[model samples]
Target: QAVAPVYVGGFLARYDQSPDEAELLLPRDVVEHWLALPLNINHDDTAVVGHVAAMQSVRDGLFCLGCVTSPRFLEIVRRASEKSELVSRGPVSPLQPDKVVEFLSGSYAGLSLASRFKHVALCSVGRRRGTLAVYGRDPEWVTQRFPDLTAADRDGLRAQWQGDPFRSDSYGLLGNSVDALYIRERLPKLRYDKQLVGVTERESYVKA
Candidate 1:
């Protein structure tokens, strides 16, 4: 069964709208809230998906419920145009959550996984909604290298012997042969990095 998300903290958008003001700034015991945005909640409008999107905002509440209005923060907004076009194709009967997340993460086209969910999440930026393949490492390489790999194949070959989340294997390689991949490890280390640290380092550090 899906466990209810524990309340943690709240957030508000950059606007001055009352409906957008969130009252529950912080959960009673937790350090944050699961769904934060609009600074205020109706208490009766149980919008779970919207809540999930809000809780995901990292900065001012400019981003929520798949809508984004931020220009400075690292938050990503779903492209209304792109998302609308893709969804308009009728019912999304084939876009599974993991695959969508994978594509959003830029893992689909390359047959790989994303380095961070935020990468894919942010891909949701502005008028577009669908999977995108970010560049760098391709998990298909790993899969091809290990023809014998199954769900276990993806798991065993993660960055380490364990597994990394964005490495394709983490999402159970798109739930090919199983009911669904349970992300044994979210955001697993796929390889080593040697690039000299710089200002951009702070960019990924905070989000990662």
Candidate 2:
């Protein structure tokens, strides 16, 4: 008998909250007693797909889940789980015990795969809740690109996203993917530059 992989991987969120979303993991472990959000089937609380059985806020910073109840879902997981089992071959061990480490604040994250569950050397930040992508990158470009943004207005909005919990860590207001698309139309690389946070840069509004 083959067991289905109950695990499904997803970020707690891929965007910052204009609508009240993920801001949980920030250089600290969440030891607060909190209510776990529902593992609903991508809908309202009326039909929950599963209950989050357990999870951890690992040392590297991520909310890892350990479940739920859905036969079709489980069957789908089962079928997908054993694609290699049908052929069966590899080398493995202690990944579980090593993995035994590590949150709170509730968000669906999405549907993905833990996939190749590598090892202890494998950094959680390299993959999981994305300790980096969350707070997002700097928006110094806000001052640069938008032609109408006066120096005073640009300065006003320069630190537009300097909200609490994480301060202004490389992230200003416009760091989302849509803005990224806008920047992408330009130099693009300027979009995800965390290092450029404190440093100054310039962009002329040529209206290309």
Candidate 3:
């Protein structure tokens, strides 16, 4: 079996801005946890991009991954605000829409990954609640991996992108009512969790 490698961006550069700035932006714990995950560099490709691409060899099927985004999360809040009953369920307090847009502009960097995968959905991160974003993949190769998926489920997923056209933006889609419903049902069942399914957690070096 081949080992899966993890990928990430510049580590030291993330700190150069200033200790306070880096902490406020990425948070130490988040950085540490991400760094601890298994990583690899294949054919000069960083682990972040390489891992997802390599997974294709196993099966051509949908693969869902999660991340935290502030904008879509604010949308989740905006929707909940229309009803007074849901106000408690919304953000702790209203966030300015203009600021949200500014935050999104910086956050869009991660969308680069969408080019390599067919983005299926964007929504709340399950484990982290309001803080993170979840992005789905339905690449042609995904179908080869999950052959057991019913035609109805597969077609329905495809229809979401076809009929609306705008449903999937240049890179991904915001959570729609149906997408949310489907994601809520589907995201939990992804078997990639519950194991050393990611990469190794620690590293060691010995004097030679």
Candidate 4:
């Protein structure tokens, strides 16, 4: 039997200043949760370029993976978004828009284990929510000896998704809509939260 690895995808603005060093943020347990299967390196190779580069200038290292900036791919995503009552959605990279869409819709699967596992902190379908803060395992454990992993968030997150919208009365499309002032009430000292997610903690070591 094989274990499924975890893949955490989404917008991560400050991921890399201009390099490939997207910090490892998902909790160590999450990675351990999907020990057998491993995450993919180019998860958002598509969106990072389309959404990230389209907004600002990550420049140079930018690579469109799920999105091709092509008419065909855009059309498919447009249709999907419209049918699902979604405001917007699209391929992340041009490499394979089909696979990207499948991954998003859960119709198809990917080698990247992270895709399967439920994400920890998510913002919304579309919008400039903020940078993604993951807390997973270090990528150094690629087929090498197992290394210990840890969760990055200790204080937890101001907000998090629990998968099913119907699970709660407040769950739904509107859940995506947050009241900035409402959230501020909780943090009386702070005006707004910085970095959607941050690496507040780290693992001591690991042994595979």
Strongest candidate by lDDT? 2
Give a tens-digit lDDT track for model 3, residues 1-208.
0011111110111222232332234334434343211111111121112222221111112223222222333453234334333222322223222222222222221111222232212212122211121111223322322333356644543443231112122123232333435544333322222111221111100000
- Which 10 residues in a row give candidate 4 its minimum summed lDDT? 55-64
Ranked by lDDT from best down, the candidates are 2, 3, 4, 1
The true-versus-predicted C-alpha distance at residue 35 of model 4, in Å, is: 14
* Global lDDT scores for all candidate models: 0.22, 0.26, 0.24, 0.23
lDDT of 4 by residue, 1-208 (tens): 0011222232322223332233334333433344211112223322221211111112111111111222333344344445542223333333222322322332111111123242222222211122222211222221111111123221111112111121212122233235322433323211111222221112211100
Each model's Cα RMSD? 19.1, 19.6, 21.0, 17.3
How many clashing residue pairs, candidate 4?
A: 29
lDDT by residue (tens digit), candidate 1, 1-208:
0011111111222222232125422222232243222111111121111212222222222222222122211111123213433323322344222222222222211111112112112221111111111211223332222222245434433422121111222223223313213433222211101011111111111111
Question: What tens digits encode model 2's per-residue C-alpha lDDT throughout 45-146?
Answer: 333334433333332223323233444433433343344331132112321110101000011212222212211111112222221111101234322322
RMSD of 4: 17.3
Once fitted onto the true fold, the runs of candidate 2 whose alpha carbons sit more than 4 angstroms away are 1-5, 9-37, 75-208
Q: Tell me each candidate's TM-score.
A: 0.19, 0.28, 0.20, 0.21
Q: How many backbone clashes does candidate 1 have?
A: 41
Model 2 compared with the native: what TM-score? 0.28
